């Protein structure tokens, strides 16, 4: 099995990780870490390094890969959470896809029934399309990475589960993403505008004219599609039931300070992502947005798709402190 | 100009770097760093992050990007070296291509003629083809990255120019690489075996049967093509002339300890690189090679070429200590 070989390779390459079998999942080699909230995510393979490249101090305690573009089954999630439970609760980060919501919400109840204090955070940052192919609402994409890092730093400093959960839901309402593909993972000199990380259709197919023009269109869409009201369910561990919560996003606006993530969906040359970033900085400056930090690289992929996404996440001094905090994972590493 | 936009983007993304104009080059924002040997490289754009993503503490002092797959002109190299010169010499790392050798060699003379103590290290790690299209001898490829980190650590701790040059030449004789492409940046289900980072032809075109079979063939080639004797010129700064030095490589063999670099040439999914790493570890274990450290990712690319390369560098305890030493660059970051 190729997927088997890929995970064995990840494990051999990174001794800070432990690959488990029966069922398969990955955790920090030092888990469970006593006394800190444990953070977990997962989803289909094909988005590497998300989420296994994010396992480590200051970020995920563990992750649950599934088959290509397919949610891990509930047994994997339950066993991974039990393995990382440090006595302070486990927070489940779930991207907004039908399969992921179903399997993670099922694991959540099984965990609850076994005495584990758990709660959830749903990510729906893709502003492009409401109700795509495998999603009720907006699709969960690259902002998931920014949220894992920020909530990961908060868990590592010792915040409670409730605190980690409220911060993740707040960030979710402040982060906005859009992606484009020039080639799947079907017409010359055309792009799928507002594409999904599983290959879901975007807003439309439109001509690619230049890098700068594509960025302008993506940026403009982030500015005008920001307003959003919807229900996101979360697990209330005190009542032991799902709570429907209306959640509100404000559009990005002049005066917002942001973290920018320019993300390779798969086969975009890094030189091009720097050109994207150059145009993005100009547009934010013109619109009154201050980019305070950035990440530019392959952080949330779709196999070998040719395209990239732009993510802008509103932040304040407290959030920036969580950004600057140490993280030690395969994909992201920085010290004090 | 797209290159202009791409370089402005790199500069805006990384305040630890300074982009210069008239002529264009990039340096550490803190250069010149007094009292340390300065390390420089450069080459055609299209291999990002090599070399600009390696500028920072513990690695390059600066780099000189040229146009796509084209060497920087000697004025760029000269001015960059003058900007980073810390009074203890400048070491130029040059990959073995006709154009790079000629421009860096011309800059070396201009530098010497201006009072700057300088010397060179030529990289010729690609074991696949002798005398390809743009090269007398063997092509310089991904081992260039490992050498910049190791020699970068030696320079950062204060080693002398001669000590840094000797280390670089020694490592060059101990590092071996081979690349394959499944698509240019051709044929169906066929690969260009032993391909060059500028699209040069390899040993041959052959059928792609599987990932594991491809890795086996690449690895076998690294074992059987390792022996090599050739002349590499270097700048003798005391005599003020080029010195022809016969240099020797021994094949890799049972008992060697290595650092492995599994490198995406452009469009290979990270999941697949881990599968590559998994097969590589098995083959190294069978052959008697101990992989002590690895790097898996996009470190020396060829635009959006679909393919990957494998590099194995023989090391000892001293070299492993230089690998583990602190490095803080756009592409490589660790403190232990």
XYZ file of C-alpha atoms in Angstrom:
672
model
C 0.000 0.000 0.000
C 1.294 3.397 -1.016
C -0.477 5.256 1.775
C 1.149 2.842 4.219
C 4.591 3.533 2.718
C 4.040 7.282 2.912
C 3.154 7.185 6.610
C 6.001 4.796 7.371
C 8.246 7.336 5.612
C 6.902 10.231 7.637
C 7.504 8.236 10.843
C 11.079 7.235 9.930
C 11.887 10.803 8.936
C 10.592 12.367 12.206
C 11.500 10.701 15.492
C 9.452 13.427 17.352
C 6.401 11.592 15.977
C 4.939 8.157 16.761
C 2.934 6.326 14.091
C 0.317 4.059 15.684
C -1.332 0.986 14.165
C -4.761 -0.613 14.779
C -6.019 1.903 14.231
C -3.650 4.196 12.295
C -2.990 7.740 13.578
C 0.032 9.905 14.452
C 0.940 11.654 17.733
C 3.812 13.605 19.282
C 6.266 10.999 20.637
C 5.925 12.629 24.062
C 2.095 12.432 24.192
C 0.188 12.363 26.394
C 1.574 15.596 27.788
C 0.113 15.951 31.257
C -1.547 19.178 32.273
C -2.141 20.879 28.894
C -5.163 20.860 26.618
C -4.476 18.391 23.770
C -5.181 19.542 20.211
C -6.154 17.247 17.388
C -7.216 17.392 13.742
C -7.382 15.184 10.669
C -8.903 14.659 7.265
C -8.167 12.935 3.984
C -4.589 12.407 2.826
C -3.610 14.595 -0.141
C -3.234 17.929 1.726
C 0.252 17.204 3.242
C 1.803 18.688 5.278
C -1.672 19.321 6.714
C -2.207 17.851 9.333
C 0.742 15.531 10.189
C 3.388 18.139 9.487
C 1.743 20.216 12.265
C 2.221 17.712 15.082
C 4.565 19.010 17.762
C 5.152 21.401 20.604
C 3.081 24.524 20.245
C 0.708 22.962 17.672
C -1.148 19.689 17.213
C -0.806 16.927 19.789
C -1.722 14.480 17.047
C -3.593 13.966 13.802
C -5.739 11.403 12.019
C -5.056 10.860 8.314
C -7.689 9.118 6.177
C -7.446 7.787 2.616
C -7.148 10.343 -0.187
C -9.617 13.180 0.239
C -11.502 10.943 2.720
C -12.247 11.549 6.396
C -10.606 9.253 8.930
C -13.154 6.835 10.486
C -14.330 7.577 14.057
C -12.253 4.786 15.640
C -9.031 6.544 14.543
C -10.176 9.839 16.033
C -11.305 8.315 19.313
C -8.075 6.344 19.804
C -5.867 9.280 18.830
C -7.692 11.538 21.335
C -7.397 8.946 24.092
C -3.716 8.615 23.420
C -3.074 12.379 23.697
C -5.485 13.238 26.538
C -3.388 15.081 29.095
C -6.190 15.313 31.647
C -7.242 18.821 30.591
C -9.591 17.946 27.687
C -9.006 17.445 23.939
C -9.989 20.133 21.410
C -11.017 18.801 17.967
C -10.314 21.043 14.984
C -12.605 19.981 12.129
C -12.634 21.412 8.536
C -16.175 21.989 7.164
C -16.817 18.932 4.864
C -19.675 16.512 5.119
C -17.494 13.503 5.853
C -15.221 15.242 8.329
C -18.139 16.734 10.260
C -19.894 13.371 10.478
C -16.876 11.270 11.625
C -15.449 13.862 14.006
C -18.834 14.539 15.581
C -19.296 10.766 16.001
C -15.892 10.435 17.686
C -16.778 13.404 19.888
C -19.818 11.586 21.320
C -17.875 8.318 21.797
C -15.184 10.321 23.609
C -17.796 12.017 25.776
C -19.336 8.643 26.637
C -15.906 7.435 27.769
C -15.407 10.390 30.096
C -13.097 12.524 28.027
C -13.845 16.237 28.152
C -13.954 17.258 24.569
C -15.100 20.139 22.431
C -14.881 21.209 18.816
C -14.023 24.022 16.496
C -15.339 24.044 12.913
C -13.371 25.853 10.153
C -15.253 27.441 7.190
C -12.899 30.129 5.841
C -13.292 29.618 2.051
C -15.339 32.591 0.901
C -15.864 31.421 -2.626
C -18.895 29.139 -2.646
C -21.763 28.450 -0.269
C -22.757 24.733 -0.270
C -20.163 23.140 -2.538
C -20.013 19.438 -3.361
C -19.023 18.027 0.034
C -19.943 20.931 2.291
C -22.973 22.404 4.069
C -22.007 26.117 4.226
C -18.454 27.326 3.437
C -15.482 25.022 2.908
C -12.685 24.684 5.427
C -9.295 25.375 3.954
C -5.865 26.957 4.651
C -6.915 29.166 7.518
C -7.095 25.843 9.384
C -3.293 25.944 9.528
C -3.191 29.468 11.096
C -5.813 28.439 13.596
C -3.863 25.262 14.572
C -0.791 27.321 15.256
C -2.555 29.996 17.309
C -4.736 27.713 19.316
C -1.674 25.338 19.610
C 0.351 28.158 21.230
C -2.525 28.959 23.579
C -2.832 25.281 24.609
C 0.942 25.091 25.143
C 0.973 28.128 27.398
C -1.727 26.487 29.522
C -5.061 28.036 28.508
C -8.148 25.936 29.489
C -10.109 23.892 26.943
C -12.871 26.506 26.984
C -10.312 29.216 26.367
C -8.697 27.249 23.507
C -12.114 26.554 22.009
C -13.383 30.173 22.243
C -10.140 31.470 20.625
C -10.457 29.015 17.732
C -14.110 29.978 17.067
C -13.161 33.681 17.238
C -10.249 33.205 14.718
C -12.545 31.222 12.500
C -14.849 34.261 12.274
C -11.884 36.516 11.356
C -10.083 34.442 8.694
C -10.975 34.444 5.002
C -9.622 32.386 2.125
C -9.808 31.912 -1.606
C -8.047 29.599 -4.010
C -7.534 29.321 -7.761
C -6.379 26.409 -9.942
C -4.706 26.571 -13.341
C -4.665 22.779 -13.477
C -6.351 19.989 -11.505
C -4.511 17.527 -9.241
C -9.290 21.776 -18.264
C -9.043 24.552 -20.875
C -5.856 26.323 -21.991
C -5.215 29.627 -20.424
C -8.219 29.316 -18.172
C -8.499 29.094 -14.376
C -10.983 27.645 -11.943
C -11.714 30.713 -9.782
C -12.663 29.912 -6.142
C -11.613 26.271 -6.401
C -11.883 23.802 -3.508
C -8.989 21.749 -2.069
C -10.705 18.545 -3.196
C -11.221 19.780 -6.743
C -14.753 21.161 -6.188
C -15.815 23.752 -8.767
C -15.247 27.406 -7.997
C -17.299 30.480 -8.699
C -16.500 29.986 -12.390
C -13.879 29.294 -15.038
C -12.357 32.504 -16.338
C -9.331 33.506 -18.346
C -6.000 33.808 -16.694
C -4.503 37.080 -17.941
C -1.620 37.673 -15.474
C -0.495 36.860 -11.939
C -1.172 40.401 -10.749
C -4.711 40.384 -12.217
C -5.531 37.004 -10.678
C -4.369 38.251 -7.285
C -6.456 41.437 -7.709
C -9.525 39.325 -8.365
C -8.814 37.028 -5.443
C -8.164 39.935 -3.109
C -11.282 41.807 -4.251
C -13.332 38.664 -3.539
C -11.892 38.394 -0.023
C -12.996 42.019 0.589
C -16.551 41.693 -0.705
C -17.440 38.126 0.359
C -16.355 38.569 4.016
C -19.825 39.157 5.504
C -21.311 35.845 6.682
C -23.873 34.589 9.213
C -24.438 30.881 9.785
C -24.935 28.157 12.354
C -21.956 26.141 13.437
C -22.610 23.240 15.820
C -20.251 22.632 18.779
C -20.201 20.018 21.554
C -21.267 21.347 24.897
C -19.499 18.963 27.291
C -21.466 20.059 30.378
C -24.871 19.227 28.859
C -23.393 16.415 26.809
C -25.112 17.596 23.589
C -24.624 19.555 20.339
C -25.342 23.280 20.512
C -26.342 25.243 17.429
C -24.535 28.575 17.549
C -25.201 31.416 15.122
C -21.709 32.768 14.282
C -20.940 36.063 12.543
C -18.129 37.201 10.308
C -17.487 40.884 9.548
C -15.842 41.789 6.226
C -12.148 42.625 6.290
C -11.891 46.386 6.402
C -9.560 49.402 6.412
C -7.648 49.433 9.724
C -7.489 45.619 10.151
C -4.150 44.109 10.995
C -3.666 40.707 9.374
C -1.558 37.565 9.074
C -1.207 36.570 5.377
C -0.798 33.028 4.155
C 0.136 32.565 0.469
C -0.291 28.817 0.016
C 0.775 26.537 -2.824
C -2.097 24.164 -3.681
C 0.524 21.855 -5.173
C 2.596 22.619 -8.261
C 3.095 26.380 -8.141
C 6.735 27.449 -8.236
C 7.827 29.261 -5.078
C 9.101 32.136 -7.244
C 5.497 32.703 -8.317
C 4.212 32.729 -4.713
C 6.627 35.551 -3.932
C 5.146 37.472 -6.908
C 1.676 36.826 -5.459
C 2.864 38.121 -2.137
C 4.261 41.228 -3.790
C 0.883 42.055 -5.338
C -1.014 41.163 -2.184
C 1.029 43.611 -0.066
C 0.264 46.446 -2.518
C -3.515 45.734 -2.375
C -3.624 45.446 1.419
C -1.700 48.731 1.697
C -4.198 50.362 -0.636
C -7.225 49.024 1.332
C -5.917 49.999 4.772
C -4.913 46.434 5.838
C -1.597 46.026 7.673
C 0.072 42.670 7.058
C 1.888 42.001 10.343
C 3.204 38.447 9.644
C 3.144 36.085 6.633
C 3.637 32.424 5.695
C 4.438 31.617 2.011
C 4.802 27.982 1.054
C 3.018 24.666 0.597
C 0.899 24.466 3.803
C -2.524 23.105 2.745
C -2.234 21.248 -0.551
C -4.466 19.342 -2.970
C -2.154 16.608 -4.271
C -0.347 18.073 -7.303
C -2.927 20.725 -8.249
C -1.495 23.755 -9.976
C -2.803 26.818 -8.139
C -2.537 28.695 -4.881
C -4.674 30.270 -2.223
C -4.659 33.480 -0.300
C -5.649 33.613 3.349
C -6.039 36.778 5.440
C -6.663 36.469 9.169
C -7.524 39.545 11.296
C -5.430 39.654 14.457
C -4.629 41.877 17.477
C -1.589 42.133 19.833
C -2.670 39.071 21.867
C -3.025 36.906 18.747
C 0.260 38.155 17.369
C 1.915 37.085 20.638
C 0.442 33.571 20.088
C 1.798 33.690 16.521
C 5.311 34.583 17.646
C 5.285 31.869 20.296
C 7.548 28.824 19.732
C 6.427 25.991 17.493
C 8.349 22.844 16.722
C 6.777 20.675 14.028
C 7.926 19.144 10.752
C 6.404 21.941 8.717
C 6.714 24.960 11.026
C 9.604 25.708 13.323
C 10.555 28.869 15.190
C 11.861 29.687 18.669
C 11.347 32.521 21.144
C 9.164 42.433 -15.048
C 8.062 39.280 -13.184
C 11.499 38.608 -11.664
C 11.463 42.139 -10.271
C 8.065 41.498 -8.671
C 9.164 38.132 -7.297
C 12.291 39.615 -5.681
C 10.359 42.587 -4.234
C 7.969 39.987 -2.750
C 10.766 37.980 -1.168
C 12.164 41.182 0.330
C 8.806 42.390 1.659
C 8.153 38.922 3.144
C 11.497 38.740 4.996
C 12.772 41.739 6.882
C 15.885 39.676 7.783
C 16.886 40.249 4.103
C 17.833 43.374 2.140
C 17.232 43.520 -1.622
C 19.739 45.795 -3.347
C 19.358 47.571 -6.711
C 21.971 48.697 -9.256
C 23.016 45.974 -9.316
C 20.454 43.469 -8.016
C 21.458 41.025 -5.214
C 20.164 40.031 -1.798
C 21.990 40.070 1.510
C 21.317 39.384 5.251
C 19.891 42.685 6.582
C 22.705 42.647 9.134
C 25.549 42.226 6.631
C 28.378 42.943 6.692
C 28.944 40.878 9.813
C 32.353 41.866 11.104
C 34.888 39.144 11.839
C 33.275 36.156 10.151
C 33.943 34.584 6.800
C 31.143 35.649 4.391
C 29.414 32.979 2.268
C 27.884 33.629 -1.097
C 26.266 31.764 -3.899
C 23.981 32.489 -6.837
C 22.673 31.264 -10.129
C 19.733 31.414 -12.434
C 16.293 31.940 -10.951
C 13.921 28.971 -11.260
C 15.496 26.907 -8.420
C 13.894 28.710 -5.446
C 14.390 28.459 -2.584
C 17.931 27.935 -3.778
C 19.735 30.291 -3.122
C 17.816 33.268 -1.646
C 15.884 31.156 0.838
C 19.245 30.133 2.380
C 20.351 33.631 3.298
C 20.555 34.110 7.075
C 22.393 33.234 10.290
C 24.298 29.951 9.998
C 24.097 29.885 6.222
C 24.547 32.310 3.261
C 25.568 35.905 3.813
C 23.900 36.741 0.498
C 23.081 35.461 -2.979
C 23.012 36.663 -6.540
C 19.970 35.604 -8.545
C 20.256 35.803 -12.369
C 17.439 35.569 -14.929
C 15.725 32.168 -15.317
C 18.288 29.328 -15.618
C 20.922 32.040 -16.275
C 24.016 33.022 -14.293
C 24.182 36.431 -12.626
C 26.630 38.802 -14.245
C 29.931 39.304 -12.496
C 29.001 42.886 -11.346
C 26.182 41.411 -9.223
C 28.552 38.891 -7.665
C 31.271 41.466 -7.072
C 28.981 44.007 -5.404
C 27.280 41.404 -3.268
C 30.653 40.121 -1.971
C 31.756 43.705 -1.291
C 28.545 44.316 0.667
C 28.920 41.197 2.876
C 32.725 41.199 3.275
C 33.385 41.112 7.021
C 37.177 41.457 6.736
C 37.847 37.730 6.957
C 37.354 36.744 3.315
C 34.411 35.771 1.154
C 33.801 32.179 0.063
C 31.948 31.698 -3.187
C 30.037 28.466 -3.719
C 29.616 27.828 -7.421
C 27.509 25.029 -8.998
C 29.279 23.423 -11.953
C 27.770 24.979 -15.088
C 29.625 26.727 -17.854
C 27.944 30.095 -17.298
C 28.192 30.028 -13.475
C 31.868 29.028 -13.524
C 32.699 31.813 -15.976
C 30.828 34.629 -14.159
C 31.878 33.637 -10.646
C 35.413 33.102 -11.809
C 35.409 36.598 -13.418
C 33.993 38.127 -10.206
C 36.650 36.299 -8.172
C 39.382 38.044 -10.128
C 37.751 41.459 -9.872
C 37.337 40.930 -6.092
C 41.020 39.877 -5.754
C 42.068 42.772 -7.864
C 40.205 45.050 -5.385
C 41.882 43.714 -2.242
C 39.235 41.190 -1.139
C 40.516 37.819 0.088
C 38.352 35.289 -1.668
C 38.228 31.673 -2.564
C 35.930 29.159 -4.284
C 34.213 25.805 -3.986
C 32.817 24.091 -7.024
C 29.856 21.691 -6.577
C 29.604 18.719 -8.998
C 27.406 16.159 -7.170
C 25.096 14.893 -9.948
C 26.432 11.368 -10.717
C 24.274 10.891 -13.815
C 25.977 12.410 -16.870
C 29.522 13.631 -17.549
C 29.645 16.703 -19.836
C 25.951 17.526 -20.182
C 24.766 20.512 -22.211
C 25.871 23.345 -19.924
C 28.647 21.570 -18.009
C 32.293 20.410 -18.261
C 32.318 17.475 -15.826
C 29.333 16.648 -13.547
C 26.453 19.031 -12.833
C 26.050 20.819 -9.489
C 22.667 20.146 -7.953
C 20.951 19.640 -4.578
C 24.024 18.752 -2.508
C 24.803 22.438 -2.950
C 22.140 23.064 -0.272
C 23.662 20.670 2.268
C 27.127 22.172 1.719
C 25.836 25.728 2.203
C 24.322 24.728 5.539
C 27.455 22.898 6.781
C 29.981 25.418 5.546
C 27.504 28.139 6.715
C 27.696 26.667 10.289
C 31.494 26.501 10.147
C 31.671 30.176 9.054
C 29.095 31.295 11.641
C 31.088 29.822 14.518
C 34.232 31.674 13.263
C 36.220 29.147 11.230
C 38.809 30.675 8.903
C 38.304 31.102 5.164
C 40.737 28.273 4.425
C 39.009 26.066 6.940
C 35.604 26.869 5.403
C 36.895 26.264 1.815
C 38.574 22.929 2.785
C 35.408 21.705 4.442
C 33.356 22.696 1.394
C 35.718 20.869 -1.036
C 35.814 17.764 1.218
C 31.954 17.656 1.455
C 31.781 18.080 -2.289
C 33.812 14.898 -2.647
C 31.456 13.045 -0.297
C 27.993 14.029 -1.656
C 26.202 12.239 -4.468
C 22.957 13.057 -6.227
C 20.585 11.894 -8.920
C 17.290 13.265 -10.215
C 14.414 11.963 -12.347
C 11.568 13.782 -14.160
C 8.132 12.543 -15.180
C 7.463 15.863 -16.886
C 9.489 18.904 -17.955
C 9.145 22.359 -16.353
C 8.155 14.233 -23.666
C 6.475 10.753 -23.243
C 3.766 8.845 -21.470
C 4.426 6.773 -18.346
C 8.080 7.363 -19.218
C 10.717 9.210 -17.172
C 13.868 11.096 -17.959
C 16.310 9.200 -15.741
C 19.295 11.196 -14.391
C 17.788 14.532 -15.464
C 19.420 17.907 -14.903
C 17.876 20.913 -13.021
C 17.840 22.959 -16.209
C 16.005 20.345 -18.250
C 19.193 18.702 -19.621
C 18.717 15.086 -20.762
C 19.572 12.263 -18.367
C 21.220 8.904 -18.860
C 18.099 7.835 -20.799
C 14.303 7.804 -21.074
C 12.781 4.695 -19.523
C 9.397 3.437 -18.356
C 8.078 4.511 -14.975
C 6.860 1.304 -13.367
C 6.407 2.436 -9.737
C 7.801 4.802 -7.097
C 9.652 2.040 -5.273
C 11.227 0.769 -8.548
C 12.282 4.265 -9.526
C 13.919 4.844 -6.143
C 15.737 1.493 -6.440
C 17.221 2.480 -9.803
C 18.205 5.935 -8.503
C 19.795 4.427 -5.438
C 21.647 1.711 -7.398
C 23.027 4.463 -9.604
C 24.244 6.437 -6.608
C 26.131 3.281 -5.475
C 27.758 2.448 -8.854
C 28.509 5.982 -10.182
C 30.184 7.280 -6.975
C 33.838 6.868 -8.043
C 35.125 9.962 -9.792
C 38.421 11.702 -10.409
C 38.582 15.128 -12.037
C 40.195 18.529 -11.917
C 38.410 21.467 -10.126
C 40.005 24.859 -10.240
C 40.001 27.062 -7.182
C 41.265 30.613 -6.520
C 44.588 30.655 -4.679
C 44.371 34.156 -3.081
C 48.011 34.135 -1.987
C 49.371 33.612 -5.484
C 46.495 35.468 -7.174
C 45.831 32.659 -9.687
C 43.705 29.671 -10.522
C 45.017 26.340 -9.124
C 44.099 23.091 -10.903
C 43.487 20.529 -8.140
C 42.838 16.861 -8.943
C 39.994 15.849 -6.611
C 38.757 12.379 -5.800
C 35.431 10.850 -4.789
C 35.066 7.347 -3.328
C 31.846 5.463 -4.021
C 29.364 5.262 -1.137
C 29.817 1.943 0.685
C 28.735 -0.185 3.659
C 29.554 1.530 6.963
C 29.037 5.152 5.690
C 26.895 7.480 7.706
C 24.901 9.892 5.540
C 22.570 12.872 5.543
C 19.743 12.222 3.028
C 18.030 14.964 1.076
C 14.818 13.930 -0.794
C 14.127 16.954 -2.904
C 11.075 17.971 -4.938
C 12.211 19.293 -8.345
C 8.855 21.071 -8.545
C 5.482 19.398 -8.706
C 5.893 16.228 -6.685
C 3.420 15.956 -3.795
C 5.003 15.834 -0.317
C 3.155 12.558 0.325
C 5.080 10.985 -2.518
C 8.457 12.304 -1.130
C 7.762 10.493 2.108
C 7.089 7.283 0.134
C 10.427 7.927 -1.582
C 12.095 8.397 1.809
C 10.557 5.161 3.062
C 12.067 3.109 0.209
C 15.398 4.973 0.493
C 15.731 4.016 4.180
C 15.192 0.331 3.347
C 17.827 0.436 0.581
C 20.323 2.304 2.738
C 19.839 -0.246 5.559
C 20.417 -3.160 3.135
C 23.539 -1.546 1.669
C 25.017 -0.833 5.103
C 24.487 3.008 5.062
C 23.197 4.709 8.251
C 20.997 7.756 7.540
C 21.722 10.069 10.502
C 19.645 13.111 9.415
C 17.297 13.935 6.514
C 15.716 16.859 4.725
C 12.491 16.171 2.697
C 10.946 19.018 0.731
C 11.366 21.525 -2.082
C 15.045 22.691 -1.645
C 16.544 22.902 -5.122
C 13.895 23.082 -7.791
C 13.543 23.419 -11.534
C 10.559 25.696 -11.957
C 7.493 23.419 -11.995
C 9.242 20.267 -13.231
C 7.540 17.096 -12.158
C 10.211 14.941 -10.517
C 12.508 14.652 -7.540
C 16.084 13.951 -6.656
C 17.909 12.016 -4.010
C 21.162 13.211 -2.441
C 23.304 11.261 0.030
C 26.189 13.010 1.761
C 28.764 10.995 3.769
C 29.351 12.628 7.149
C 31.119 12.105 10.517
C 30.496 13.419 14.069
C 32.095 16.807 13.362
C 29.939 17.263 10.264
C 26.789 16.136 12.067
C 27.506 18.803 14.733
C 27.684 21.459 11.988
C 24.352 20.100 10.603
C 22.680 20.413 14.033
C 24.052 23.904 14.655
C 21.590 26.828 14.577
C 20.339 28.090 11.202
C 17.797 30.870 10.633
C 16.821 31.358 7.008
C 13.578 31.539 5.034
C 13.799 27.860 4.032
C 15.695 26.270 6.976
C 15.147 27.053 10.624
C 16.316 25.257 13.735
C 18.072 26.119 16.994
C 19.461 22.707 17.968
